[PDB]
Amino acid sequence: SAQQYQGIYVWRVENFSHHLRNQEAGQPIVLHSPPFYTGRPGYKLCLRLHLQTPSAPRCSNFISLFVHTMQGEFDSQLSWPLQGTIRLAVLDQVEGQHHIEVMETKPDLQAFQRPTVMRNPKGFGYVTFLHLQALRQRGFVKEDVLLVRCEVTPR
């Protein structure tokens, strides 16, 4: 039902410059978000964000962003696998020119099953979600905060 997808999560990544300075020094960055529910009842999800190093083959200096399913309170009353459309965004806090990727679920992927551990090791998303030079040029980071949004809509 529609109420199972009514949630929208905005991940506030504070002190972004700290991660950036470490990334510039050649440190991979990986961040794990708080959990959120697509609805009540609904699916429990979390996000994983990477800053790839300046020398990573094929994806140097990118933000990578992946969605992971989790074991949630409502799981017994949900259909599985999770099916729908997932919208991932980095938000423009002033001009509304968000960077948005839209992706449909795939029912045959482990990432959309209910995991047998608390957090699914398999996630789904973009290795090359947003390049750090594009993030800088657009000025998405305001007061050292990056906003990452995740919305799920039904089929």
Binding site: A111, K122, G123, Y126, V127
Partner: peptide, 8 residues
């Protein structure tokens, strides 16, 4: 892209 990746 998008793709499934593994993060233990």
């Amino acid at each position: 892209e998008p793709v499934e990746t593994t993060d233990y």
